[PDB]
């Protein structure tokens, strides 16, 4: 019985914490259910304006600072972008290295999302103090793989640390938590809370390793520095000792994925099965990632091992090809000047114009990207449905398993619970592919170390860079004129998922997903957080 109050009226949550960037969410609620929703991004920076007239080689360095959480992916999309504009085909080794860095990014980003941003919506940290750590060890010994981190002794030591922390009276990041004093919408047993909390702390250490792995190829993290026009700069990344360290670190990260992330995810999902009926949307888009052929955008779309595709109306029998000319951005409900609706990104316009807070006619710094007039959800759930629908063997196996462990139908995936599970699903798949991808580059690198191709700056040209970033379909679009940036437009996964209504008044993915959200407690509306967080929002990515 999903808890739900009788509350009628507005709720505003601002800031939305545990996301990247600055989001205000407004809902109308009736009899304890969300009946309308607005996604209101509260910061503008204007990178696209900043880039006008600059060196196209410089773009990757500006755009990477769209975001520090999905670090890399913007530098990668810019490089693909400019590579496309100059018409250079990057060397095999460069494709491999760029793709492996993206893989390391998925691992790091997803692990931190589940534990450090998402989990506090489902896990009551204080209730962990009520567990018997012996009973919790027994519980962990009976669900998850055997590990010393899961022993009574380790769980007790976590409990003791947390205890002295709460008894200190300085709750720090837990101050005013929605779970303090219990909450109807939090269902977990104290033992589950304790296990998940132990893993939250472990994850804080494990993500350092994930970032180290990533840095071996990326040069540093956050904000990598190894991509150049025509390929990559990191010859050392092709060598044996660094690659063996990269593998070793990657396997430790993946052991923690398989040992802690997935089992915690599945326990959470098991207790909150009702969330498989909340927060669903209908259309899914992906440009794909991990391609065997990145010589062009077309080749990227065709040979992405996490396939590209478009699903409309939850129809898993008709995956359409991505039509890049069909993408456009509206601004009708955004803080931009009149007359900018319907713009393909090659013709994109970024002419900011603020009005006032909670102006229903203009309420976000995000543009509204649309695909033939339809809003599109992007990200792990989109990737998962598209891959599953095309019979991608890893996705089919893992998804069908998750479905089998949870005892729910594939249609239960069109939901916040689904969205959350998808994220972990593709994490286990990236993990299963790491050793193969690393061997491929180690072997290729040792035969020949070519890593960047020659290229020439054209007087005039356009190019597009595609990537499927941790949050979804990312595209960067350049017009070069006079060998300089004439226009540079970012269309980012969070723009797709979290932007405002389009020119037709049509709700974006998150706004639709929020409709019918139950609110057990209007003072502490965690359910709003559950669904918004499920999209893994990044407003800095979204608005740039």
């Amino acid at each position: 019985p999903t808890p739900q109050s009788t509350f009628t009226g507005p709720i505003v949550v601002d800031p939305i914490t545990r996301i990247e960037g600055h989001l205000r969410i407004m809902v109308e609620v009736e009899n304890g259910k969300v009946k309308d929703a607005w996604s209101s991004s509260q910061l503008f920076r204007g990178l696209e304006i900043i880039l006008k007239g600059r060196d196209p080689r410089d773009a990757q360095h500006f755009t990477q600072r769209a975001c520090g959480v999905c670090t890399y992916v913007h530098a990668l999309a810019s490089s693909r972008c400019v590579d496309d504009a100059v018409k250079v085909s990057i060397p095999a080794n460069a494709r491999m290295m760029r793709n492996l860095v993206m893989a390391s990014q998925y691992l790091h980003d997803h692990l931190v999302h589940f534990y450090h941003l998402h989990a506090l919506d489902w896990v009551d940290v204080t209730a962990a103090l009520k567990a018997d750590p012996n009973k919790a060890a027994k519980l962990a010994a009976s669900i998850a793989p055997a590990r010393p981190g899961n022993s009574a002794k380790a769980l007790k030591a976590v409990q003791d640390k947390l205890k002295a922390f709460v008894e200190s009276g300085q709750l720090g990041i837990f101050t005013n938590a929605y779970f303090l004093g219990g909450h109807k919408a939090y269902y977990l047993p104290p033992e589950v809370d304790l296990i998940a909390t132990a893993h939250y702390l472990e994850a804080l250490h494990m993500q350092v390793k994930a970032a180290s792995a990533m840095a071996i190829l990326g040069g540093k993290n956050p904000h990598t520095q190894f991509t150049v026009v025509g390929g990559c700069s990191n010859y050392q990344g092709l060598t044996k000792d660094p690659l063996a360290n990269y593998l070793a670190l990657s396997k430790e990260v993946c052991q923690f994925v398989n040992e802690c992330y997935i089992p915690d995810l599945l326990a959470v999902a098991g207790f909150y099965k009702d969330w498989g009926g909340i927060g669903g949307t209908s259309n899914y888009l992906a440009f794909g990632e991990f391609a065997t052929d990145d010589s062009s955008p077309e080749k990227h779309l065709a040979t992405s091992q996490f396939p590209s595709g478009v699903i409309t109306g939850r129809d898993l029998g008709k995956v359409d090809n991505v039509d890049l000319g069909a993408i456009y951005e509206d601004v009708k409900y955004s803080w931009y000047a009149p007359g900018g609706d319907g713009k393909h990104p090659y013709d994109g316009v970024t002419d900011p114009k603020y009005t006032k807070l909670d102006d229903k006619d203009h309420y976000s710094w995000m543009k509204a990207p649309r695909y033939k007039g339809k809003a599109m959800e992007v990200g792990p759930l989109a990737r998962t449905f598209i891959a599953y629908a095309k019979g991608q063997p890893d996705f089919k196996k893992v998804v069908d398993m998750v479905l089998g462990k949870l005892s729910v139908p594939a249609t239960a995936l069109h939901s916040t619970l689904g969205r959350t599970a998808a994220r972990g699903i593709e994490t286990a798949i990236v993990c299963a592919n790491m050793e193969k991808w690393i061997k491929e580059m180690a072997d290729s690198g040792a035969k020949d170390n070519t890593l960047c191709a020659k290229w020439e700056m054209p007087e005039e040209s356009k190019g597009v860079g595609l990537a499927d970033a941790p949050r979804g379909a990312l595209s960067h679009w350049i017009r070069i004129k006079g060998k300089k940036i004439d226009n540079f437009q970012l269309v980012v996964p969070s723009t797709w998922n979290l932007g405002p209504r389009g020119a037709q008044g049509d709700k974006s993915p998150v706004e639709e997903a929020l409709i019918g959200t139950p609110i057990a407690d209007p003072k502490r509306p965690v359910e709003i957080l559950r669904t918004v967080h499920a999209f893994d929002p990044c407003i800095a990515c979204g608005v740039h």
Binding site: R18, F44, G46, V228
Partner: protein, 263 residues
């Protein structure tokens, strides 16, 4: 017992969360140990449990703490239209940051954005972004770089809690971390001295790890500790064959661009 831990308020303004991310890569100590045993991190939008009014209230409790607090700012301040282009809780970021700064024991600017204005202040600066010290008119301890090494940031935090404000350069950077040129500690220095430069990234010279000065490297005019301490215990840009961008210098977006040139 119950040893009281110093209150830290962390604000996010016009930023990319890269500084927060960098901070949590600390291993001396790890971030868990730091917030359990060393400080009381009392507001931090990226990871705090509370949201909305609950979050706002936790901020205002931290600000009114009997014991005072230190202020950590990540990100520049957009000042156009009364600062309404950057808001939290329905308040301009300039206004909240101003209010938190008035009573801070100290202000630490984490990253180039907060310190000096950063990526949003780059021409033509549509949001009229400023750095903290400029926007507020107060002295800040600057921990720049885009983002800074967690060793620099945590070191500064620990240093200010246990010894005091550390010696600062002309740009407000602790001389402990920013006293030396990237270039002076670069393993490729002997290549530079012998005028052995890679002319492109595909060249055999690049393969042989020649100096990257001719490919825009700003090591010679950048103050940071990168080649000495590395990032993530493993690497730094030039080791990865890429010129320094000069990302710890004020306004580097405009002073160090074009990045692949020296002109």
């Amino acid at each position: 017992t119950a040893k009281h831990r110093p209150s830290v308020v962390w604000l996010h303004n016009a930023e990319c969360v890269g500084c927060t991310e960098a901070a949590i890569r600390t291993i001396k100590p790890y971030i868990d140990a730091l917030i359990l045993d060393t400080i009381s991190l009392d507001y931090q939008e990226t990871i705090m449990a509370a949201a909305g009014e609950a979050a706002e209230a936790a901020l205002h409790q931290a600000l009114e703490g009997k014991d005072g607090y230190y202020l950590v700012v990540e990100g520049g301040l957009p000042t156009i239209d009364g600062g309404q282009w950057g808001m939290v809780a329905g308040h301009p970021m300039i206004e909240t940051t101003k209010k938190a700064a008035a009573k801070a024991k100290g202000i630490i600017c984490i990253g180039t954005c907060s310190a000096y204005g950063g990526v949003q202040k780059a021409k033509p600066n549509p949001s009229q972004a400023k750095g903290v010290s400029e926007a507020l008119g107060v002295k800040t301890i600057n921990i720049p770089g885009c983002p800074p090494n967690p060793i620099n940031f945590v070191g500064a935090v620990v240093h200010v809690l246990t010894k005091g404000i550390p010696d600062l350069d002309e740009n407000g950077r602790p001389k402990l971390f920013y006293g030396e040129l990237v270039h002076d500690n670069c393993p490729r220095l002997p290549h530079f001295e012998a005028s052995e430069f890679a002319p492109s990234f595909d060249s055999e010279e690049a393969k042989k790890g020649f100096c990257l000065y001719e490919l825009g490297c700003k090591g010679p005019v950048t103050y940071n500790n990168c080649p000495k301490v590395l990032f993530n215990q493993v690497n730094w840009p030039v080791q990865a064959g890429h010129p320094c961008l000069g990302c710890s210098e004020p306004d580097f977006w405009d002073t160090m661009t074009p990045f692949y040139e020296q002109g």
